[PDB]
Amino acid sequence: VARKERGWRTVFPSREFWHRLRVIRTQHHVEALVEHQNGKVVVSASTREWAIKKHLYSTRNVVACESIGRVLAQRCLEAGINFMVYQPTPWEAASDSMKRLQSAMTEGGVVLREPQRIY
Amino acid sequence: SPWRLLGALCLQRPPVVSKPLTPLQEEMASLLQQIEIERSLYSDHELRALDENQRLAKKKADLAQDLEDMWEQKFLQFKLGARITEADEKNDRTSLNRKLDRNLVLLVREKFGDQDVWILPQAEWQPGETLRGTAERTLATLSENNMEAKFLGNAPCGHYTFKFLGAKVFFFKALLLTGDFSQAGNKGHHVWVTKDELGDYLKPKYLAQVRRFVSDL
Amino acid sequence: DSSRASLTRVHRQAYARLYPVLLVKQDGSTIHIRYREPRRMLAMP
Amino acid sequence: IPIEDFITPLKFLDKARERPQVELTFEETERRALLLKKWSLYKQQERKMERDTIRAMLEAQQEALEELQLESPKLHAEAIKRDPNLFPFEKEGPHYTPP
Amino acid sequence: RRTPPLGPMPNSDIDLSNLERLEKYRSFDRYRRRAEQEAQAPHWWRTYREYFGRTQQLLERKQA
Amino acid sequence: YKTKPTHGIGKYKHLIKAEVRAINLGTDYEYGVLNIHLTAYDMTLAESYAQYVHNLCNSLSIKVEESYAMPTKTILTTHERVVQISGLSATFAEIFLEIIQSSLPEGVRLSVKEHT
RNA sequence: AGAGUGUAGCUUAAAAGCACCCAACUUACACUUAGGAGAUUCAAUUGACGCUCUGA
């Protein structure tokens, strides 16, 4: 029922969501965020974290993104969050590690598409 | 202050022979030849080898080996010029063919009175002389030959100033195009050095620091 | 460092085989080159 | 005249049937992977070496021009002057067998 | 009637005479990174944010 | 707006340069445009060495105007690659040329010829 | 002998981020994608290990 910021049509990304999944792939680390429109990071999962980093071979590969997708999805089911928006750039859309990340999220339990606002 | 005005030069030989490969470069080169073959597209040499013996099997059922054999024996005809005139000599330090795959540097004994120093070859300049022309005069003076070198610019390369009367020492860098180095068994003490003997022949701080502008590769 | 620009491969894809045929122009100077029909040595008269 | 030679020859179309077979094993691609990994190691160490040489020699020549400037204020003006002998500058690549 | 800016203007310190000597954004992603960093900084104009807003561990971890 | 202190906060055309002899005047000296021809009997060593030159030049902050190639010749075939360069220093002429000298693979020659 | 000292290239980063390299698309570059390598000199804020500058 709550408002989404409907506007922002000339600017990337759109602010029309309640929760956004924002992947930050650095040189060394894959990072995954779940945010509000406020910018309040609700649920994160980075490989800069000893609980997940030590079970990985390399913190940047497709295995790192499937791992951070399983871990992020399990962390978000227990936060009462079931609907994100993931809006990628058209090269990051067609990357293998984000297709593997999205398949990890959808198989985890999270639908990557928000329901409409009830007016 | 009376400055003892000193110019010099650091002479270079470009290697005519290429360096040998790393064994890791051997495995990578072999791998690139394999995967290079794997993506090629029907060379006529095998079209004149593969289907031709199929058609000869069809004719016998009812020459590429000579080309390869002639190429093999003609490969056995011309012996290669050996890349190592380096270990057989082992003491021809004055000769220009001491090494072939590395750079070679001219390096001359000088006997002074207060000193007695093995020195990268110098000259004495005049304020009327150009520093590049100081090094050009340095070329055909000390060796007494008919070489052909080549400079690059009036930019210097390495400066070292020692006193005991002020002084300064300027190090340029030349490059041998060719050489008509006549009578290589000179009375002078020029020695060609790869890199390692420069830390052997040259001890002090004005001479153990030449290799930081010697093109080491 | 005379081996950096040597570890190559044909960067095209519509290319046939090439073979490491040693070439001499006139001077007894052998260079490894790739040419059609696997020759071993060359000399230009 | 804009005539180049990147145009592909027409014969490379029809008989493309000599090698459709590309099969390998596990350990062949493992050793191929170790060659790419350790070869990027080797090449990275190489450009660390060359970057060290450009840094060392470039600071060497800048320190040299500073000392030549402060010990001769009429020679660093001509040390910057360029040579007209570097228009037709050439060097052929190295060989194997000396003549 | 120009009035002078209150704080420092953006795009001031990078504004040089030789832009072709300045290395550029080769991508879209780097501009998105720097651009989000400039979004999060406190500014002096009116912005959207005003209105809508030990050693053994590294030892065993490195060996681990 | 023209009277507000944030006037011209959104302007950008001074930040894009949306648009030959040598410059050797009195102290700051630099070559004009150049040409570096690479001739070889190999497409591979000439193309790949032109790559190594071009990535050196981008790794040493040099304007590289073009990197085109010249047509071949019926002879064996001789291949050429032209990698243009504009603007060097006194030290950087020497230090820049010594690496191109000291990195040639096999029999491929150079040229520091200029334009026209 | 003294002085300045000190995280991988750079950091008023605290084991990070940019830098960097190979492979692929590109003539090539660039983008992008797949990978790779990385470090807080050694002991108790302090001394001693390595570098730079000034000395003989």
From Swiss-Prot, chain A:
Can you name a GO cellular component term? mitochondrial large ribosomal subunit
Highest taxon above the source species: Eukaryota
- What are the record keywords, sorted? Chaperone, Mitochondrion, Ribonucleoprotein, Ribosomal protein, RNA-binding, Transit peptide, Transport
Q: Name one GO biological process term.
A: mitochondrial translation
**UniProt entry tagged with the keyword Transcription regulation:** no
> Subunit notes for this chain?
Component of the mitochondrial large ribosomal subunit (mt-LSU). Mature mammalian 55S mitochondrial ribosomes consist of a small (28S) and a large (39S) subunit. The 28S small subunit contains a 12S ribosomal RNA (12S mt-rRNA) and 30 different proteins. The 39S large subunit contains a 16S rRNA (16S mt-rRNA), a copy of mitochondrial valine transfer RNA (mt-tRNA(Val)), which plays an integral structural role, and 52 different proteins.
Q: Which family does it belong to?
A: Belongs to the universal ribosomal protein uL18 family.
Its biological purpose is as follows: Together with thiosulfate sulfurtransferase (TST), acts as a mitochondrial import factor for the cytosolic 5S rRNA. The precursor form shows RNA chaperone activity; is able to fold the 5S rRNA into an import-competent conformation that is recognized by rhodanese (TST). Both the cytoplasmic and mitochondrial forms are able to bind to the helix IV-loop D in the gamma domain of the 5S rRNA.
- Protein name as it appears in the record: Large ribosomal subunit protein uL18m
| Gene, per the UniProt record | MRPL18
Curated annotation (Swiss-Prot), chain B:
Question: Where is it localised?
Answer: Mitochondrion
The family note in this entry says:
Belongs to the mitochondrion-specific ribosomal protein mL46 family.
Major localization class: mitochondrion
Superkingdom:
Eukaryota
What does UniProt give as GO cellular component? cell junction; cytosol; mitochondrial inner membrane; mitochondrial large ribosomal subunit; mitochondrion; nucleoplasm
Q: Which organism is it from?
A: Homo sapiens (Human)
Within the intact protein, the region shown is 43 to 279 of 279
Q: Which residues carry this modification: N6-acetyllysine?
A: 168
On assembly, the entry states: Component of the mitochondrial large ribosomal subunit (mt-LSU). Mature mammalian 55S mitochondrial ribosomes consist of a small (28S) and a large (39S) subunit. The 28S small subunit contains a 12S ribosomal RNA (12S mt-rRNA) and 30 different proteins. The 39S large subunit contains a 16S rRNA (16S mt-rRNA), a copy of mitochondrial valine transfer RNA (mt-tRNA(Val)), which plays an integral structural role, and 52 different proteins. mL46 is located at the central protuberance.
One GO BP annotation is: mitochondrial translation
Please name the GO terms that the record assigns under molecular function: structural constituent of ribosome
Recorded protein name is: Large ribosomal subunit protein mL46
Q: What keywords is this UniProt entry annotated with?
A: Acetylation, Mitochondrion, Ribonucleoprotein, Ribosomal protein, Transit peptide
UniProtKB/Swiss-Prot annotation, chain C:
Which superkingdom is the protein from?
Answer: Eukaryota
The listed locations are: Mitochondrion
Question: Subunit arrangement?
Answer: Component of the mitochondrial large ribosomal subunit (mt-LSU). Mature mammalian 55S mitochondrial ribosomes consist of a small (28S) and a large (39S) subunit. The 28S small subunit contains a 12S ribosomal RNA (12S mt-rRNA) and 30 different proteins. The 39S large subunit contains a 16S rRNA (16S mt-rRNA), a copy of mitochondrial valine transfer RNA (mt-tRNA(Val)), which plays an integral structural role, and 52 different proteins.
Per the record, the similarity remark reads: Belongs to the mitochondrion-specific ribosomal protein mL55 family.
Q: What is this protein called?
A: Large ribosomal subunit protein mL55
Q: Which species is listed as the source? A: Homo sapiens
Q: What is the lineage of its organism?
A: Eukaryota, Metazoa, Chordata, Craniata, Vertebrata
Gene of this entry: MRPL55
Q: Which span of the parent protein is shown here?
A: 34 to 78 of 128
From Swiss-Prot, chain E:
Where is the protein localized? Mitochondrion
User: So which residues are the signal peptide here?
Assistant: none
* Top-level division of the source organism's lineage: Eukaryota
Record's subunit section? Component of the mitochondrial large ribosomal subunit (mt-LSU). Mature mammalian 55S mitochondrial ribosomes consist of a small (28S) and a large (39S) subunit. The 28S small subunit contains a 12S ribosomal RNA (12S mt-rRNA) and 30 different proteins. The 39S large subunit contains a 16S rRNA (16S mt-rRNA), a copy of mitochondrial valine transfer RNA (mt-tRNA(Val)), which plays an integral structural role, and 52 different proteins. mL38 is located at the central protuberance.
The similarity annotation says: Belongs to the phosphatidylethanolamine-binding protein family. Mitochondrion-specific ribosomal protein mL38 subfamily.
Q: What is this protein called?
A: Large ribosomal subunit protein mL38
Tell me what organism the protein belongs to. Answer: Homo sapiens (Human)
Its gene is MRPL38
